[PDB]
Every structure is written in C-alpha cells, then in structure tokens.
Design a binder for these strands. Structure first.
Lengths: 251, 121, 217, 345, 121
RNA sequence: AAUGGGUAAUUAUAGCGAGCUAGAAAGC
RNA sequence: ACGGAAACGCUUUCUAGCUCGCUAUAAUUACCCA
C-alpha cells in the first residue's frame, strides 16, 4: 500500500533530430563523412531503437508505449515504472548513442481518470519547456522542476533518493511531517529560511534518541551541505528527491 | 544597520564574533551567554512579529521602545548580553523602526540571531 | 441513539495555581511570571488543556499496566477517554474539557480583595554565599472557584462502558486533590476541591436519576 | 496508593518573619493607642486631601526633624487633629520591648517589613518557606551532597553546583527530580493579631554588647501552632522526610558546635520539640551550608558593613513572654527558631 | 512630558546628564545614586503598572496621586533622589496621568531609567 | 558619650521553543 | 447569416487527531551611617 495512485506520461523528443539528420556527421571531417549511407544507417538505428527496442525496456515495467518512433515517444503508465523506464531508456540510449543525441523527456503526474488530450497537452508543454532548457532536460511534474538528465539520475535517483529512503527506513521518529517541512523549506527559500532550517535540523538533532542519533547528525551535516550550497543546482534536486520519496511512501 | 536582504549574514557573524568558553575546556567553543538569556529577549520580538500582521505600525509604538528598554536592561545584568549587543548592533537597529515592514524585518533578524545561536552547539 | 452528558464541578482552590502567562513585556520589579488569563477581563482562568494533561498522567499512574515511554500507548481504558494519536478507531477521545472560568467575582469583592491575583515573592537563596535571586510568580488567590465543565459522549458503541469509565473519571476527580493541577507543585499551588457536582444529560435520552449514585459518594 | 502523606505542625518559639518585600516606611504609620496602625496610605492621602492640608503633607514628609516623636506622623495626626482612624488597613498590637532606652518612643520606629499576606489580608506561611528551610537541613545532613557545592571554576566564588541533587527532565533517563516528591503545601491563614514587629538585635562576637538595628520586621507572635501538609511519592525523598526527625537535631547539633558555642546560652532558646530555622533574619548559616562557606560566604562583604572577622554576628530580638522559651531576662529571643513535629496521616 | 517614541531617550540623555562621584576617586565617575535607592523608586510604580491592566484608571487615580507624595518623600531623603527627579523629570511626568495608557507609559519610562542606570556602573 | 537614621546587594536564573498522523481523495 | 448555437470546472469533504507552561527555587543576606 506504499505508493500513490498516479499515472505518469512521458513524451520524449530527440533533441534536433532534424539537425542531427540534415547536418549530423558533416560537422566531423572535411565532408569526408557527409554521405547518404551513414544517414540511412543512422536513421535505421533510430528506427531499430525507438521502434523495436522500447519493448525490451518496457518489458518488466508496467506501462503502455502508446506512440514511439522517429523523434518522439509518448508512453503512458504507472509512475514508478515510468520514471524507471525513462532512467533505463536514457541510460541505455547514451550507451546506444555514445552520449551524443541527448533526449529531452517530460514526465507529468496525472490523477486517476483524467482525460488524455487534456493530459497530452500538459505533457507536451512540459516537454517543450524541457526542450528549451538547454540542449536537453527532463521536466518532472511541472516546468519549475527542470534538470539535466546527467544531473537527474546521478544526483537525485542514485545518490539523494537512496540516502533519503535509507534514512527514513532505518528510523521511526521522523515520519512524513518532517519531510513535508523539509519540502516547504526547500520550496520557499529566502535567505532567512536557511537560518530557519539551521534551527530546525539542530533542534531535531538533540531530540532524537541517543542510539540512532549520529545518523541524524551525519544526515543534517549532509543536508545543510546541499541546502546552503549557493548554486540552486543541488536544491530543487533535493526537493524533487523528497517529493519522489513521499510519493513512494504514500499511504 | 539592517535592510531586507543583508540581515541574516549580520546575525550569522554576530553569533560567530561572540566569544566563548576559553577557560575550563569542558565542551569548549560554547557561549558564555546562555540560550535562556536570548529566548527571554526573543519572546518580546515574537509577540511583536505576530501581532504586527494584525495591527498598524503606529499602534505598536508603545512596545517598540519597550524592546529598547528590555535589551538595555538584560544587557545590564550579565556581561554576556552587553557583549552581545556590542557584537550584534541591536540598539543601533532599534532606531531603524519606521514602519510595520522594517519592524518585521528586525524581528526576522532576531530570529536569525537565535537560530544561529542554537546552530553552534 | 446518541446522547451527551455534562459534568459540572467547582474547582475551589486552596493556595491557588500559577499556570504560566502569555505576555513577555513583563516588568523589571514586578511580575516576571504571570498566570494564564482571559484577555478581555484579565481574569485568571483554568484552561481545560492543563486539566486534560494533568489527568492523563494522574490516571496513567493507576490504569497503565505497561510503562508509557510516549503518549499514544495508554492502556485503552484511558485511550478512549483522552484519545490516541495512533489507534485506528481511537483517534477521538469523547471527553471535552471546557476551560474553567472564575465564577465568584461577587462574593470575593465582599472579601477585601483588591484584584483577583497576587504577587508572591519566591526567591532563590544561593546555597553558598547566601545571595538572593528573586522571582515574583503570580498565582490565583486562595479561595476562588472555577466552573469546570466537562462533556461526555454516548453513542451506539457504548453499551456498558458509559459506567466503566466513570470510576476512572472519578479517580481523576479524587486524585486531582492528590496532585497540583500544574504550577510549581512542591510549593503548594494546586490543592483543590470540586464542589457541587450536578451531572445531567444535556443532549439525548439518558437517565439522570440512576446516574446520580456513584458521582459524589 | 504510593502517595505517602505527612503532616508537619510548627510551634513558634521565636519571632518568625517571612517575605513580601514591601514595607511601611518611616512616615507611614500611626501610634496613638498602644496599637500600631497601618492604613492604606493612598486611601489616607485621598481622604486627607478633603481636609485640604495636603500641601503641608508635602513638607511633612521631607521634614528633617529631631526628637523623632514628632517625625512618625502622629504629629501630623494630632497636631492638625486628623484622628479619624477610618483608613482601610489592619491594626496590630505593640511589642512593649520595641525600643531600648527611649522613653515615650513607642512609635518612633522607622521600617516595618511586611509579613506575607494573601489577597484576603490574613497572614499565612507559604510552603516555599518551609521547603527552603528543609533543603539546607537535608543538604547538610547528607555527606554526598556536601563535597562540591562550590566554585565550579566559573567566577569569583559564585554559587552552588546545583547539580548534586537530580533536577529537571534529564533527557534520556527516568523521572528523577528528587525534591518534587516533597510537596510542601502552604499554611492556612491564621489570625491577623499575631504580629509583634520585633527589632533585629545584634550580639557581637569578641564584644559583649547588644547593639540593636533600626529595622523592625513584622514577625509572628510566639507560641502559635501552624499546620503544614507534606506529601511524598518517591521513596528517597520519602525516606528523607522520614529521617527529618534525626536530621533536624543533627544539623542543629553540628551547627551549635560550629557556630553557637563560645556564645552564652542564657539568650539562646531551648528546643522542647523538633527544632528548625525558618526565614528572614536567622543568619546565613541557617540558609546555607555551614561547613562549606567558611571563607566563601564572607568574601563578598568588603564594604561598609563587613561581617566581624569570620562567621556572622549573633542575631537576637525582643518580644514579650508567655507560658518560658527565653531562658534569661530582658527577652532576647532568637528570630526564627521554630519547632515542629511530624506524623504520617 | 514624554510620549511613546521618546521616553527611552528622555531617560537616555538624562542619565548621562546626572553628576557622579568627583571625589572618592577609586573607580571614579560612579553614581551618587545607588541601585537600592532606585528600586525603592520603581517598586512603587510597578505594582500600579499591573493594577492598571485589571482595573481602570478612574478607579486607580488615588494611588498615583499618593505616588506623587512618595516620589517627593524618597526625593526628600537623599541628595541623589532629590537630584534624580528633576535631572530626569519624573515629577514633571507625574502631573500628566491623563489615561491608563499614559500611566503604563510612565511606568515603562521608570523601567527605562532603571535599565539605563544598570547599563552603567 | 547620647540621639537621629536604615544602608548596600541580587529583580528571575538553567532548559525545553514544538513532536508525530493525514499532504487531497472519491464522482461527474 | 462568425467551427457557429446551446455548456457554472462543478458535487461531497471540521486543518483535524494526541499533548499539564512544566522542572529546581525560604525576599533573603550583611551590620551599621552623623
């Protein structure tokens, strides 16, 4: 019963497949590789990935690839499997495409029995906001959560989410109210809220029991690191990590 | 002085600049000033800061100078709070209360003072 | 059916109670620890929250078989009277403890009382060097009364447990005169009595006459 | 039920003053009968302004006048015939031995510290008084609490450790808080006319003289009984209130050999019950740790009023006689030597 | 006279204005006023300061009218309190008691006097 | 040697400053 | 003779449930000043 009754919709887009098709290899060399055979082989490779291989990445995961191919993937499904499917799709696409042609996905949460052309429009809006971020970005649950994928899976979905999950699994004082207040302090965030968070973590530091106390001490040392990191590249990441954890433990 | 954006760092290195338990190194780098000699001051600023959002500025100006009474008084009892008001320019910022907004800003500065005072040990 | 009954008592003080007041803009050489106060008339009143939290530990000293370590671990004879925070059907508590107001303003003006509080100097003599450290903790005067209201529930889920919890509630009423209602405790500050018990059903059909046997006896 | 109550009853062998801080100053009372009177001075002034002579009342109060029989407002209330005595207030009787070698001065006293009174106007003794008296006895008569109630290397002979006794939440432990299990309740309000305003009387060491002091605190009339409810809930403080019957005489015995010896036992009272020292003027040794504050208490007094050499000067009073409890002539009592007996009810 | 915004400063520049011990030149420029002789001044005011909140001023004016004579009397007993009441115009402020808010303002002004005396020496 | 007078000190100290539960569901 | 006419982002829902302003604390100390 842990997890929220959602359905997430990802619409990928290959970042400038028109420019990667028309110019593409012609950047390299003196026009030595500006041939037709390489372009046909590359487009058949895109066909073989986006038109066959998505049924391999979606095999165990529970979703529905509605449309795929060319430079678009519209895949509806359940949100843990959708996020893990985007994770595996890019983390084997950059193994497939050597890190070149970064894909710009957009994943929106939608409630139960909400219509789909209402939903495809918002997914496309998050998709184009992820497009215009830079060359590539993920847009997660709203256009203000816009990270690079190289920042999203490594920092949030590999480092931060596992620390956050293990920290709240192996303790039972700090339940969900503490996570909600951490999300709110991550979201408002003026200069004074860093002082309020430095008060909050330190006031909870001497309130946990003595046995599992230094877990909280290293976690507040590791949390005030990214909260006051003065970059805003390590802050909305942590807010999204806590949102993913809360949505994973929803009763 | 205190503006809308600069006061938190002011309170930060007005907590840092305060001198600590140098003699008797039993958990050293700990303040001579006690936290109950700071919360008894901030319980004035909190009952201003939340009764400022209900009222005018020009209805509050009786308690506003009483803040300058009590800060002078509690600075006069212990040498630690006199040291505090020398490091943290409290009485020099109580002249800078001209409206509801700068009063709430000064109360946020007092909250930053107590927050960073609790932060270091 | 659904009934709802009322327990009215008079908290008559003996050497009354300091429940920490609100305003920090206090004094220099006056009250620096006031009593809680009804701010429209500045009367010292007894809130129901101190009553509930005192009766929680006072009845957990009796009816707990297990050690507590926390709230939301009471022995379920109290957890339907004071509520759990965790038990699935016992989030509510069916006992409403209304704030007791100082009633006898009329008779205590016949007694030569200036104002309905007092200032009781209570210094801290230093056990070496004999120096003094005064405090002026303000308490309600010695013989005020308070209208301790109380409201109990009756549903179609209380067949015989209406009378099961009454001698648990009356245990609180005659153990509140064993403890001190909040304050400083070991300097008096809480010895009280509960005059003029008049228990009736303010809502719903329930009997008042066979109900009136175990309350005052 | 683990609440083990007691009952302490306190006879008053001595003048016993406690508390309340405020006072009636020099030009603030009336002595025209043999009874002192304290009206409400605001009520007195607001009724006297109808007599319209209040401007002279401005000059009467600053009047530096010798032969102080005309100083203490009897002259204002007989020289200008305002002698109504309707001012709201409480009358008390006189001592009789209030002043020494001052004929017709039964009224030229200056400062009367009030006894503690509630809002009703009836004086009582609060349980904080008896608990502060109890804590010095139960501190000195237990050897584990007498070693390091000292400097803590924090200042200049500052204070007690305040940590030899368990105190507070102590987050991570059980509920310790030993003195919470001694719930010293406040006394019942007794009669108003049991007050005498005894003078502080210093009896000097190395100088056989009885030099008195101009501070006449309103104390309690001798040989009056006082009730005290005392409950116990923890076994250690319960055993301390059980062992009070040994610890009181033990503290008084070791305090006699430390302090009361070399001083003549004619003025020193007899016990006749369980002895104890209550507040306001019984000497700092009855309010502190006597074998711990040898040079530590007296170090502060480097002023115009230094304690002679080491240890405090003996303090006596003057109050009339009943029953004897004085054991000499001229009525030198001991200012705070009370009696108690205890029984679990 | 004193109002809500100046009564601290009324008690500020008056305290630097009082004389000190020109002779007795050990820790010099110490006050002729001693702390007990100012707590005897404040302890009259601070009971009425809290009686004012429960009662009303028209049921209270008699005690402040007698408190006039009390400040005269404490001024009439020393060379410092006779100096204090006019170097810091307490007897001037005692003629204007017009409502309970001005009464509490005068009591806070007395508290400011005690605070700024405790701030020095 | 009398008599006139109180004088000086501390004015609250040390803490706790919020803890978990729910964080939108169910239909149109 | 307007991709237009007709179209309420709407119906239901207690910011709730649990929580002592508490813990230690004699208005006291000292003996004087012309």
């Amino acid at each position: 019963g842990l997890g929220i009754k959602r359905l997430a919709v990802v619409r990928l887009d290959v970042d400038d497949l028109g420019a990667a098709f028309m110019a593409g290899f012609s950047q390299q060399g003196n026009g030595q590789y500006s041939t037709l055979s390489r372009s046909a082989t590359f487009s058949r490779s895109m066909s073989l990935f986006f038109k066959v291989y998505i049924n391999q990445f979606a095999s165990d995961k529970k979703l529905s690839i509605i449309y795929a191919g060319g430079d678009d993937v519209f895949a509806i499904g359940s949100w843990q499997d959708i996020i893990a499917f985007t994770v595996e799709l890019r983390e084997n696409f950059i193994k497939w495409t050597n890190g070149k042609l970064t894909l710009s996905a957009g994943i929106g949460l939608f409630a139960d029995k909400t219509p789909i052309s209402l939903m495809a429009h918002q997914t496309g809006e998050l998709e184009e906001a992820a497009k215009g971020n830079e060359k590539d970005s993920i847009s997660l649950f709203s256009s203000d959560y816009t990270f690079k994928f190289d920042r999203f899976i490594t920092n949030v979905y590999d480092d931060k989410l596992e620390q956050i999950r293990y920290f709240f699994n192996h303790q039972d004082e700090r339940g969900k109210n503490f996570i909600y207040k951490l999300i709110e302090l991550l979201r408002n965030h003026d200069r004074m809220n860093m002082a309020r968070l430095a008060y909050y973590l330190t006031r909870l530091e001497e309130l946990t029991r003595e046995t599992d106390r230094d877990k909280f001490k290293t976690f507040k040392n590791l949390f005030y690191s990214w909260y006051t990191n003065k970059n805003d590249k390590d802050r909305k990441e942590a807010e999204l990590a806590l949102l993913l954890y809360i949505y994973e433990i929803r009763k | 002085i205190l503006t809308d954006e600069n006061y938190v760092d002011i309170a930060e290195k007005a907590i840092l600049k305060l001198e600590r338990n140098t003699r008797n190194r039993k958990n050293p780098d700990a303040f001579f000033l006690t936290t109950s000699k700071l919360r008894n001051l901030l319980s004035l600023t909190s009952t201003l800061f939340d009764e400022s959002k209900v009222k005018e500025y020009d209805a509050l100006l009786d308690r506003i100078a009483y803040l300058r009474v009590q800060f002078v008084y509690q600075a006069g009892r212990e040498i630690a709070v006199k040291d505090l008001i020398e490091k943290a320019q409290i009485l020099e910022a109580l002249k800078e209360i001209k409206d509801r907004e700068t009063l709430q800003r000064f109360c946020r500065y007092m909250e930053a003072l107590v927050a960073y005072f609790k932060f270091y040990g | 059916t659904f009934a709802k009954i009322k327990f009215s008592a008079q908290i008559r003080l003996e050497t009354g109670l300091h429940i920490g007041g609100s305003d920090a803009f206090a004094a220099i050489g006056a009250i620096n620890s006031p009593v809680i106060k009804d701010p429209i008339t500045n009367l010292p009143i007894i809130p129901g929250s101190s009553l509930k939290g005192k009766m929680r530990t006072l009845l957990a000293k009796v009816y707990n078989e297990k050690v507590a370590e926390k709230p939301s671990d009471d022995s379920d004879i109290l957890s339907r009277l004071f509520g759990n925070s965790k038990d699935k059907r016992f989030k509510m508590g069916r006992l409403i403890f209304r704030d007791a107001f100082l009633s006898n303003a009329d008779e205590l003006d016949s007694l030569g009382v200036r104002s309905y509080t007092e200032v009781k100097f209570e210094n801290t003599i230093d056990r070496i060097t004999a120096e003094a450290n005064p405090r002026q903790i303000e308490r309600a005067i010695r013989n005020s009364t308070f209208d301790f209201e109380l409201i109990y529930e009756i549903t179609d889920e209380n067949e015989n447990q209406v009378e099961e919890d009454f001698k648990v509630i009356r245990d609180g009423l005659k153990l509140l005169e064993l403890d001190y209602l909040g304050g400083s405790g070991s300097r008096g500050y809480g010895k009280v009595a509960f005059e003029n018990l008049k228990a009736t059903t303010v809502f719903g059909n329930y009997d008042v006459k066979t109900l009136n046997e175990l309350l005052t006896a | 039920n683990d609440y083990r109550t007691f009952k302490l009853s306190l006879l008053t062998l001595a003048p016993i003053h406690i508390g309340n801080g405020e006072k009636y100053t020099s030009r603030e009372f009336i002595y025209e009968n043999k009874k002192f009177y304290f009206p409400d001075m605001g009520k007195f002034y607001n009724k006297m302004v109808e007599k319209r002579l209040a401007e002279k009342f401005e000059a009467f109060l600053i009047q530096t006048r010798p032969n102080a029989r005309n100083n203490r407002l009897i002259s204002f209330l007989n020289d200008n015939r305002i002698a109504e005595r309707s001012f709201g207030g409480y009358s008390i009787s006189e001592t009789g031995l209030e002043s020494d070698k001052n004929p017709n001065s039964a009224g030229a006293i200056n400062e009367v510290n009030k006894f503690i009174r509630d809002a009703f106007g009836n004086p009582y003794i609060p349980g904080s008084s008896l608990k502060g008296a109890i804590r010095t006895i139960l501190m000195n008569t237990t050897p584990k609490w007498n070693n390091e109630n000292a400097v803590n290397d924090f200042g200049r002979f500052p204070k007690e450790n305040k940590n030899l006794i368990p105190w507070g939440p102590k987050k991570g432990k059980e509920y310790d808080d030993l003195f919470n299990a001694i719930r010293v309740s406040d006394s019942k309000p007794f009669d108003n006319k049991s007050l005498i305003l005894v003078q502080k009387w210093d009896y000097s060491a190395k100088t056989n003289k009885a030099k008195p002091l101009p501070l006449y605190r309103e104390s309690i009339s001798p040989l009056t009984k006082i009730e005290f409810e005392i409950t116990t809930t923890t076994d250690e403080a319960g055993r301390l209130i059980e062992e009070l019957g040994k610890r009181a005489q033990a503290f008084y015995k070791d305090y006699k050999a430390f302090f009361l010896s070399e001083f003549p036992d004619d003025k020193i009272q007899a016990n006749l019950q369980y002895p104890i020292y209550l507040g306001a003027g019984s000497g700092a040794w009855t309010k502190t740790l006597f074998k711990q504050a040898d040079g530590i208490l007296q170090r502060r007094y480097s002023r115009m009023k230094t304690k002679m050499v080491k240890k405090g000067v003996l303090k006596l009073t003057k109050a009339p006689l009943k029953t004897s409890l004085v054991k000499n002539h001229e009525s030198f009592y001991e200012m705070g030597k009370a009696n108690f007996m205890i029984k679990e009810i």
